[PDB]
Design a protein around this ligand. Sequence first.
Ligand SMILES: [Cu+]
Length: 100
Amino acid sequence: MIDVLLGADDGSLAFVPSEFSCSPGCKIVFKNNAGFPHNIVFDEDSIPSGVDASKISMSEEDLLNAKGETFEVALSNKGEYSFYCSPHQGAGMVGKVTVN
Ligand SMILES: [Cu+]
């Protein structure tokens, strides 16, 4: 599995890592680190065809509010999955996972 920090240790509004690669069955655990609240959203138009975004994404309205809170994702279909934090998207808090 891949552990991803929500917020850099220094408080920067970033996923760490932000771009990473894995294979079918890939599991990702996003953990609130700094600069929260944060969330993790995948838009349907920015993930592979035939993937249900609602099954991998937080709702834009929901947030992880405290250090250490987690949101887990498991991926199957190959392709590129772009994601972002909704409150911090405009600050560049975005990422992409590639399943090859
Ligand atoms: Cu955020």
